[PDB]
């Protein structure tokens, strides 16, 4: 329908889907580079994670402060261009290093390989910052203005955005894997750069069309000084405790990451069962999104967080039982993980809506940058914990630690709900 193809909501969905497709393809490419030229060393993956996390921790407040002053179209297009240019310029380097692979591995002094590694990391670390900035500005500012007083429209928007993310997370790696299988990594990392170029152009035009469509988007109602001011202004926000609770859920190993997949591999599983496991995780995620939508419609915005916390903790009780009780253990563990996905996703959806609905119109970027900073602080702590404990039994301890941290986060959200209602 012409109406549902010109309204300024399908264009947001299309732009977001293109962006996430490119992002996930590029992430898969970097993972392949790591596993090929370094043998997926857990230490180097953890160092890469620490670099990204620390970089967003020290700089989230500054990026949010920058977003809060300038104009929306300007900042959106600048962030988009920086992201896509960085991704293209790194895909070219990945192509070159994939071509002359064995040369580097076997007939060059190690310092050139080290330099290539730190260069790829330093470019990915800027791509990640640009993606963070576009996330802040589009999700937390543009999505909230393109749907006005109505509160169900915003919820549907967030839900379908999360569904798009969930689908692409499993669709894009498969496509790039096929292209690298029936071709070569030198072709995959070139298809990625071409995709990102054409996508940058199309998304630029789509952003301009959106900005032309809604006139209510041009009316901006709005060293260390800004950093400290932002953090202290985030401390005393009415939703500080719910935001802290959401932050706490990133300290976890119960998911699909660099360590738990290696654990599964050690438990003698197959590729196909892992693929269908990821598919089941995506199915449960979509279930969680629709469950959040219905709950929010019926009971209320705030108690949905409590329901989701109870669900996640209920499944994590199986997750923690899985440690003490050679197939029952791993089956219960994976069942608990895939079931708790529902509560996890619906809880973070409702916390996101709490964030982007109460805070003042002239401080979205700064406190959302601080929220990203806290999420990445806990992610940095997670990676630190993984570094010191690589052994398999240590995983039997990390499960307990992760459930404890989830319990802490939901205790904090319960305190918030008691203060409010």
């Amino acid at each position, epitope marked *: 329908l012409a109406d549902y193809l010109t309204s300024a909501k399908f264009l947001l969905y299309l732009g977001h889907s293109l962006s996430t497709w490119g992002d996930r393809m590029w992430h898969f490419a970097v993972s392949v580079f790591l596993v090929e030229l370094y043998g997926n060393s857990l230490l180097l993956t953890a160092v890469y994670g620490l670099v990204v996390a620390g970089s967003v921790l020290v700089l989230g407040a500054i990026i949010g402060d920058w977003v809060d002053k300038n104009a929306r179209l300007k900042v959106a297009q600048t962030s988009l261009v920086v992201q896509n240019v960085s991704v293209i310029l790194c895909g070219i380097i990945l192509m070159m290093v994939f071509l002359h692979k064995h040369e580097l591995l*076997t007939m060059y002094h190690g310092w050139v390989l080290t330099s290539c590694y730190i260069l790829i990391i330093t470019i990915a670390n800027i791509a990640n910052l640009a993606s963070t900035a576009t996330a802040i500005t589009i999700q937390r500012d543009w999505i909230v203005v393109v749907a006005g007083e109505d509160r169900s429209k915003l919820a549907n928007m967030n839900a379908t955005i999360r569904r798009i993310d969930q689908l692409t997370n499993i669709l894009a790696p498969m496509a790039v894997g096929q292209i690298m299988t029936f071709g070569s990594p030198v072709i995959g990392c070139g298809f990625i750069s071409g995709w990102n170029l054409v996508s940058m152009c199309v998304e630029y035009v789509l952003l301009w069309k959106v900005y032309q469509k809604t006139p209510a988007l041009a009316v901006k109602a709005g060293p260390f000084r800004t950093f400290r001011d932002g953090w202290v202004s985030y401390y005393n926000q009415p939703v500080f405790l719910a935001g802290m609770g959401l932050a706490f859920l990133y300290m976890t190993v119960l998911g699909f990451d660099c360590i738990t997949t290696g654990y599964a591999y050690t438990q003698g599983l197959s590729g196909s069962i892992l693929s269908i496991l990821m598919g089941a995780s995506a199915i449960t995620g979509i279930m969680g999104t629709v469950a959040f939508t219905w709950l929010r419609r019926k009971c209320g915005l705030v108690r949905t967080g409590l329901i989701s916390g109870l669900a996640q903790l209920s499944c994590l009780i199986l997750c923690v039982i899985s440690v003490f009780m050679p197939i029952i253990s791993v089956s219960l563990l994976f069942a608990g993980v895939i079931a708790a996905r529902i509560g996890l996703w619906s809880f973070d959806l409702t916390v996101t809506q709490l964030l982007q609905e109460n805070v003042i119109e002239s401080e979205r970027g700064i406190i959302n940058g601080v929220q990203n900073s806290m999420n990445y602080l806990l992610d940095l702590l997670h990676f630190i914990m993984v570094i010191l404990a690589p052994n398999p039994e240590a995983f039997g301890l990390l499960v307990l630690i992760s459930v404890s941290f989830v319990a802490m986060g939901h205790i904090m959200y319960f305190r918030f709900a008691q203060n409010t209602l």
Partner: antibody, heavy 118, light 111 residues
Framework: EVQLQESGPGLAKPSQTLSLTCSVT????????WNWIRKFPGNKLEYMGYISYSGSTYYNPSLKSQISITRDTSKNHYYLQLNSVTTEDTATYYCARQGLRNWYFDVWGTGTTVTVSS | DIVLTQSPASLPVSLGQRATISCRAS??????????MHWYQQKPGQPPKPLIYLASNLESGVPARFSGSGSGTDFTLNIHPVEEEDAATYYCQHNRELPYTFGGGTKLEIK
């Protein structure tokens, strides 16, 4: 379809010069490494050196003879020149093309014998 | 420099059976996810031929009776089943660092 073919002289005298040509039909010499290998009378193969796809060059330091691995990019040829030959140069010389996709001597030539005497 | 010791000298076998030849290095010839140990087949009167590359792969067109396996410093090539034409010489060559080196050669025969 890649093909190599050697050429050169039959025999030589002590303290002379040998200029073995290798002609490559089906692919340029500006793609992957081009190596000179020699099998002695017997079984012990031996690596002599290579010329790269970018004018680089390398000689086996364990070799007791002066070798020069040159190339001519017009006729699509590359040359091995042995100087100051000796009674321990009699061997069978093969070309090979160390590729860049799988990193092994994947295409050889028929090879030519060389013997020194009086 | 890396020295590849090949064993045994000559390997007699009988048709239909399975034959195993192995050459051991003196250092590690394996980098991240890749091991540089290739196997060559040379009949009397012809240049060598590529059977296995990167110690576990198979060339385009070689009979599937040839299998490669190994890592670290010990490798192994298996033929099953042998034929009357497999009486040849088999070499193992590494690529880890210059200068490259070839094995001693296993003089397979048929009884």
């Amino acid at each position: 379809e890649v093909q190599l073919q050697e050429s050169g002289p039959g025999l030589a005298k002590p303290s002379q010069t040998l200029s073995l040509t290798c002609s490559v039909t089906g692919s340029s010499i500006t793609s992957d490494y081009w190596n000179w290998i020699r099998k002695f009378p017997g079984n012990k193969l031996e690596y002599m050196g290579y010329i790269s796809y970018s004018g680089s060059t390398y000689y086996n330091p364990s070799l007791k003879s002066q070798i020069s691995i040159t190339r001519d990019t017009s006729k699509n040829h590359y040359y091995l020149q042995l100087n100051s030959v000796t009674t321990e140069d009699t061997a069978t010389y093969y070309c090979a093309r160390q590729g860049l996709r799988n990193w092994y001597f994947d295409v050889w030539g028929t090879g030519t014998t060389v013997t020194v005497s009086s | 420099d890396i020295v590849l010791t090949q064993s045994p000298a000559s390997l007699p076998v009988s048709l239909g059976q399975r034959a195993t030849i192995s050459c051991r290095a003196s250092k590690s010839v394996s980098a991240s996810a890749y091991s540089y140990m290739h196997w060559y087949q040379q009949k009397p009167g012809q240049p060598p031929k590529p059977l296995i590359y990167l110690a576990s792969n198979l060339e385009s067109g070689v009979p599937a009776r040839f299998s490669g396996s190994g890592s670290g410093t010990d490798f192994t090539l298996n033929i099953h089943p042998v034929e009357e034409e497999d009486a040849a010489t088999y070499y193992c060559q590494h690529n880890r660092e210059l200068p490259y080196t070839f094995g001693g050669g296993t003089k397979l025969e048929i009884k």
